[PDB]
């Protein structure tokens, strides 16, 4: 019995190919491993984190180098408009002269892809100018990569396999991460900012060789050391400062004015300095809360247990939590995932709204790509967070400790929870769809005067409260009579109101019934996806149908056709069904963003506000209208720079349509097939000579379901990305 799946000796004895399959499948499920002990597990996750760090460092340094080698940077910095960035040298023995020529036109002497990854804007904005420096940065990042790998090995070793005490300590790490890894981080961030970048924005090159010879401000630290902190905020950059030059320069270093730099349309480096500085101080002072070995500090368990309301309204309040979290790792995993998911969301939301990169909000390709990519990342992250919370329930949960407190009370009212979620999702669906189709029928009868168009009154309210006075509520930020108006009049409100009054920046666009309706569709998608996920998470312990489901673990295919059939009852399968709704929602939000921004950049935003309230308008005017170029990327005539994108379009369509077969057909059929087939293979003459090792069978139910989902999602994301990029670039 071959050593296939090592960690799993039973499979290692399996003479079928499912050996190979599942041995691959459960590689990293260290809980489900042989002789798994706790300190073992911990040192394993420790090496894993090392691996992840090394990978990410290699990724970044690799992009750094590929640019530093084959990019158009040092020309690009000159004209930040008519210079498109070079991705990486194209090489292929298949490409004919037409493609070479067509691919050659776009960068320099040789076919090249045009990177749409914003790294150009970023790096130049931070102060990157010359290829020499990019080489330096890349090689240094690779240095750190190898260092992390070596740390992985060294800490694997016996004399450094760490103690479970230093592992499970919490206050120490929390203090160290809220003081050092965060505060000092932003502090050194500001350090580079002020001592390097803003000089370069003054056209002032300051390298490592001479940076020990330049005061970043007229008077070194004297006003601070007197307590005169206002002095460093004097003489800011003019509204005429040609970016990266000494023209229109100023001498303040820590400003607060609001509004974008008028030429860059990118916010003030001085403001960025003061921001990261302020939050650095806040973090460092925050990291002094809890009790390490100094008597002073906090007692986490004390705080928790004290945090329990009278009147038994929560009963045990926060009883038994401290350990159920300080022990169960699935819980922390779920927490961290949900957190970073929300953070990726907010990242995209603020990136498009207030582009902080120099000459960002001009490369619409860059903007759209960045935004939608971070969106999809966040969606995936949250879905996984929920899956892992469910697994925490199925395995690490205990009733005795968590008994009586909020955790128990959850499972107590799970029924009402799920029921109300179902109801809200159902009503949203009903009314939103009905309204849309009424709009469509009024359109198709050519009676647009009849269709309904709700006004986003609340949103206009909030924006007028924000100071965009257009609609004329004029209270508390666009009411000049406002006390806050008068108070903060002199500091950032000027640039703030200016930029919010511009209608060409991405700042607080106007709004209407289209925005209203798509908002409600978004809310519905959110609610129903969360519903599916949480039902799957909570019913993982015990169901009325299968009261002992907890005895089977997280994943299992089915439970026999009896009892009236049990298809896909695992919480695993609940997640497997939630993923579809997640994709649906993210697709909707990205479509809407893309259409409105296209209409903005072109000019007929009226066309958006009209064709955006009925689905036929959406479809015909947005997809079928924007498809015309891609499907012409080549033709029986020739080709162009978009032939590849048309090809990828079609390729994704095929991936999708093939993964469908996975999703729909099930096993026993293919099993009968493969049986007849193997009879043929051995009974035909001269073929029975060779004989395989691992026996052939169809895929297990869950295996097939997963491979199908993979095919589906891959095809999906490919087609959409190709379409989007083709449209934006071939049109702008």
Partner 1 sequence: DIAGLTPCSESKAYAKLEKKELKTLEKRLKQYEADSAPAVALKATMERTKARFANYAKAGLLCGNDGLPHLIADPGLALKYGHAGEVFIPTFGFLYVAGYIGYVGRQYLIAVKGEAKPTDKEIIIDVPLATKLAWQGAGWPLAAVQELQRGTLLEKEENITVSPR
Partner 2 sequence: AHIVKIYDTCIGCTQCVRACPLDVLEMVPWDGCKASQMASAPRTEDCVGCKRCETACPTDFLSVRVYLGSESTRSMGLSY
Partner 3 sequence: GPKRGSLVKILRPESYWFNQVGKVVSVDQSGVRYPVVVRFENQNYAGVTTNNYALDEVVAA
Ligand X SMILES: CC1=C(C/C=C(\C)CCC[C@H](C)CCC[C@H](C)CCCC(C)C)C(=O)c2ccccc2C1=O
The response to whether 91 counts as a known ligand-binding position is no
Q: Which parts of 204-233 interact with ligand CLA (CB under 6 A)?
A: 214-217, 220-221
Q: By CB under 8 A, tell whether 476 contacts partner 2.
A: no
Nearest to ligand X of 47, 710 (CB atom): 710
Residue appearing with tokens 């079609």: 650
Q: Does 457 bind partner 1 (CB under 8 A)?
A: yes
Q: Which of 30, 556, 580, 591 binds partner 2 (CB under 8 A)?
A: 556
Nearer to partner 1, 53 or 411 (CB): 411
- Was 383 annotated as part of a binding site? no
**Binder of residue 442, out of ligand X, ligand CLA, partner 2, none (CB less than 5 to 8 A by kind):** none
Q: Which of 227, 295, 562, 685 binds partner 3 (CB under 8 A)?
A: 562
Give me 589's structure tokens.
């939000």
Q: Which of 162, 218, 434, 547 binds partner 1 (CB under 8 A)?
A: 547
CA-to-CA distance for 409 and 405, rounded, in angstroms?
Answer: 6
**Total residues in contact with ligand X, by rule CB under 6 A:** 9
Rounded to an integer, what distance in angstroms lies between the CA atom of residue 145 and that of residue 139? Answer: 10
Sign of the alpha-carbon dihedral angle for 577, 579, 580, 581: positive
CB closer to partner 3 out of 544 and 693: 544
Q: How far is CA 437 from the centre of its chain?
A: 33
Which of 139, 491, 545, 654 lies at the binding interface for partner 3 (CB under 8 A)? 545
Residue span binding partner 3 (CB under 8 A) among the ranges 66-74, 259-267, 541-549, 569-577:
541-549
- 330 half-sphere exposure, CB direction, 13 A CA radius: 18
Residue 89, beta-bridge partner list: 112
Q: List the one residue from 699, 702, 717, 726 that touches ligand X (CB under 6 A).
A: 699
Among the listed residues 158, 561, 668, 685, the single contact to partner 2 using CB under 8 A = 561
Check binding of 6 to ligand CLA (CB under 6 A). Answer: no
In 3D space, the residue among 86, 78, 70 whose CA is nearest the CA of residue 359 turns out to be 78
Binding partner of 296, given ligand X, partner 1, ligand CLA, none, CB within 5-8 angstroms per partner class = ligand CLA
Q: Does 670 interact with partner 2 (rule: CB under 8 A)?
A: no
Output the smallest distance, CB 560 to partner 2, in A.
4
Is 567 among the residues that bind partner 3 (CB under 8 A)?
A: no
Q: Which of 318, 333, 331 is nearest to 401 (CA)?
A: 318
Contact between 698 and ligand X (CB under 6 A)? Answer: yes
Which of partner 3, ligand X, partner 1, none binds 414 (CB below 5-8 Å, type-dependent)?
partner 1
Question: Encoding tokens for residue 645?
Answer: 């994108």
- State the nearest-atom distance from the C-beta of 678 to partner 2, in Å: 6
What tokens were used for 585? Answer: 């929602």
Nearer to partner 3, 193 or 538 (CB): 538
Spatial distance between the Cα atoms of 692 and 681, rounded to a whole number of angstroms: 11
Q: 501 is written with which tokens?
A: 């009054």
Residue selected from 94, 563, 683, 693 as contacting partner 3 according to rule CB under 8 A: 563
Using CB under 8 A, which of 79, 400, 449, 551 touches partner 1?
449
- 678 lies in the site for partner 2, by CB under 8 A: yes
CB 373 within 8 Å of CB 381: no
Cα–Cα distances (Å) from 555 to 42, 390, 481, 613, in that order, read 24, 11, 63, 43
Q: Is residue 11 a contact residue for partner 2 (CB under 8 A)? A: yes
Of residues 634 through 673, those in contact with ligand X by CB under 6 A are 661-662, 665-667, 670
**Distance of alpha carbon 390 from alpha carbon 334, whole angstroms:** 9
Footprint on residues 609-628 left by partner 1 (CB under 8 A): 609-610
* Cα dist from 482 to 259, 271, 475, whole Å: 21, 25, 7
317 closest CA partner among 229, 405, 378: 405
Tokens of 36: 């798994």
How far is the CA of 471 from the CAs of 12, 353, 501, 512, in angstroms? 71, 20, 12, 12
Number of residues that bind partner 1 (CB under 8 A): 30
Q: CA–CA separation, 362 vs 118, rounded Å?
A: 11
To partner 2, the closest distance from the beta carbon of 63 in angstroms equals: 45
Task: Single out the segment in contact with partner 2 by CB under 8 A; choices: 318-326, 338-346, 398-406, 560-568.
Answer: 560-568
Q: Which helix (H) or strand (E) holds 377?
A: helix 364-396
Question: Binding residue per annotation — 616?
Answer: no
Q: Please tell me whether 318 is known to bind a ligand.
A: no
Give 180's contacts (C-beta < 8 A, 6+ positions apart).
287
CB of 14 to partner 2, least distance (A): 5
- Cα–Cα distance, 269 to 358 (Å, whole number): 10
Alpha-carbon gap, residue 483 to 489, rounded angstroms: 10
Residue nearest to ligand X (CB): 698
Cα–Cα distance measured from residue 649 to residue 635, given in angstroms and rounded to the nearest whole number: 15
129 belongs to the binding site for ligand X (CB under 6 A)? no
Which residues make Cβ contacts (< 8 Å) with residue 611, sequence separation at least 6?
Answer: 617, 618, 621, 622
- Contact with partner 1 (CB under 8 A) among 241, 541, 596, 711: 541
CA distance 698 to 701: 9
Q: How far is CA 195 from the centre of its chain?
A: 32
Task: Please work out, in degrees rounded to the nearest 5, the angle formed at the alpha carbon of residue 276 by the alpha carbons of 138 and 466.
Answer: 125
Q: Which stretch binds partner 2 (CB under 8 A): 11-19, 102-110, 359-367, 622-630?
A: 11-19
Q: Using CA atoms, how far apart are residues 184 and 162, in angstroms rounded to an integer?
A: 26
Q: Which residues of 519-548 are buried (b: 16+ CB within 10 A; e: fewer)?
A: bbbbebbbbbbbbbbbbbbbbbbeeeeeee
| Residue 310 in the binding site for partner 3 (CB under 8 A) | no
The four Cα atoms 603, 606, 612, 618 give a dihedral, to 10 degrees, of -50
**Interacting residue with partner 1 among 26, 453, 558, 709 (CB under 8 A):** 453
Where do contacts with partner 3 occur on this chain (CB under 8 A)? Answer: 544-545, 547-548, 562-564
Where do contacts with ligand X occur on this chain (CB under 6 A)? Answer: 661-662, 665-667, 670, 698-699, 704
Where do contacts with ligand CLA occur on this chain (CB under 6 A)? Answer: 28-29, 58-59, 61-62, 65-66, 89, 91, 117-119, 122, 187-188, 190-191, 194-195, 214-217, 220-221, 277, 286, 288-289, 296-299, 307-310, 313, 317, 333, 337, 340, 343-344, 347, 351, 370, 377, 380-381, 383-384, 387-388, 391, 419-420, 422-423, 426, 457-458, 461, 554-555, 572, 575
Residue positions forming the annotated binding site for chlorophyll a = 653, 661, 669
Residue positions forming the annotated binding site = 558, 567, 653, 661, 669-670
Where do contacts with partner 2 occur on this chain (CB under 8 A)? Answer: 10-11, 13-16, 18, 547, 552, 556, 559-563, 675, 678-679, 682, 695, 697
Residue positions forming the annotated binding site for phylloquinone = 670
């Amino acid at each position: 019995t071959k050593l296939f799946p090592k960690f799993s000796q039973g499979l290692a004895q399996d003479p079928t190919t499912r050996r190979i399959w599942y041995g691959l499948a459960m590689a990293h499920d260290f809980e489900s491993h042989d002789g798994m002990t706790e300190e073992n597990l911990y040192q394993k996750i420790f090496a894993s984190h090392f691996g992840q760090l090394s990978i990410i460092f290699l990724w970044t340094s690799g992009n750094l180098f590929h640019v530093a080698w084959q990019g158009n940077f040092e020309q690009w910095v000159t004209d930040p408009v008519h210079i498109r960035p070079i991705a990486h040298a194209i090489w292929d023995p298949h490409f004919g002269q037409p493609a070479v020529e067509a691919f050659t036109r776009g960068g320099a002497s040789g076919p090249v892809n045009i990177s749409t990854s914003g790294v150009y804007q970023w790096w130049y904005t931070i102060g990157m100018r010359t290829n020499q420096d990019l080489y330096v940065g890349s090689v240094f990042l690779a240095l750190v990569s190898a260092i992390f790998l070596f740390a992985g090995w060294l800490h694997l070793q016996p004399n450094f396999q760490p103690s479970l005490s230093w592992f499970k300590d919490a206050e120490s790490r929390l203090n160290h991460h809220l003081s050092g890894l965060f505060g000092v981080s932003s502090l050194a961030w500001t350090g580079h900012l002020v001592h390097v970048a803003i000089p370069e924005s003054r056209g002032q090159h300051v390298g490592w060789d001479n940076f020990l010879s330049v005061l970043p401000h007229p008077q070194g630290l004297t006003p601070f050391f007197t307590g005169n902190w206002a002095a460093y905020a004097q003489s800011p950059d003019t509204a005429s400062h040609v970016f990266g030059t000494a023209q229109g320069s100023g001498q303040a270093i820590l400003t607060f004015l609001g509004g974008f730099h008028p030429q860059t349309q990118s916010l003030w480096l001085t403001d960025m300095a003061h921001h990261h500085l302020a939050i650095a101080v806040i973090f460092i002072v925050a990291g002094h809360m809890y009790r390490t070995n100094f008597g002073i500090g906090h007692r986490m368990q004390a705080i928790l247990e004290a945090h329990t309301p009278p009147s038994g309204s929560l009963g045990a309040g926060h009883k038994g939590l401290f350990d159920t979290v300080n022990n169960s790792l699935h819980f922390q995993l779920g927490l961290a995932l949900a957190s970073v998911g929300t953070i990726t969301s907010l990242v995209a939301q603020h990136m498009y709204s207030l582009p902080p990169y120099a000459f960002q909000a001009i490369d619409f390709t860059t903007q759209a790509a960045l935004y939608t990519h971070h969106q999809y990342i966040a969606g995936f992250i949250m879905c996984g967070a929920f899956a892992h919370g469910a697994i925490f329930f199925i395995r690490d949960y205990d009733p005795e400790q968590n008994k009586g407190n909020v955790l128990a009370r959850m499972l107590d009212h799970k029924e009402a929870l799920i029921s109300h979620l179902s109801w809200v999702s159902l009503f949203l669906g009903f009314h939103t769809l009905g309204l849309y189709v009424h709009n469509d029928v009024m359109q198709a009868f050519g009676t647009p005067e009849k269709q309904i168009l709700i006004e986003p009154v609340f949103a206009q309210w909030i924006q007028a409260a924000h100071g965009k006075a257009l609609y004329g509520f004029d209270f508390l930020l666009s009411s000049k009579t406002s006390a806050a108006f008068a108070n903060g009049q002199s500091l950032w409100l000027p640039g703030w109101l200016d930029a919010i009054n511009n209608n060409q920046n991405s700042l607080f666009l106007t709004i209407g019934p289209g925005d209203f309706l798509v908002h409600h569709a978004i809310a519905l998608g959110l609610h129903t996806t969360t519903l599916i996920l949480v039902k799957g998470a909570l019913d993982a312990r015990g169901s009325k149908l299968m009261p002992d489901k907890k005895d089977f673990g997280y994943s299992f295919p089915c439970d026999g056709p009896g009892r009236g059939g049990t298809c896909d009852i695992s919480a695993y399968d609940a997640f497997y069904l939630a993923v579809f709704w997640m994709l649906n929602t993210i697709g909707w939000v990205t479509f809407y963003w893309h259409w409105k921004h296209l209409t903005l950049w072109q000019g007929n935003v009226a066309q958006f506000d009209e064709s955006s309230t009925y689905l036929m308008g959406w479809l015909r005017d947005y997809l079928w209208l924007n498809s015309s170029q891609l499907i012409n990327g080549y033709n029986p005539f020739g080709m162009n720079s978009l032939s590849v994108w048309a090809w990828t379009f079609l390729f994704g369509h095929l991936i999708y349509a093939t993964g469908f077969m996975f999703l729909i057909s099930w096993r026993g059929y293919w099993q009968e097939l493969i049986e007849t087939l193997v009879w043929a293979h051995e009974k035909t003459p001269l073929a029975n000579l060779v004989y395989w090792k691992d026996k052939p069978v169809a895929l297990s139910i869950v295996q097939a379901r997963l491979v199908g989902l993979a095919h589906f999602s891959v095809g999906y994301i490919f087609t959409y990305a190709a379409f989007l990029i083709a449209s934006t670039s071939g049109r702008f």
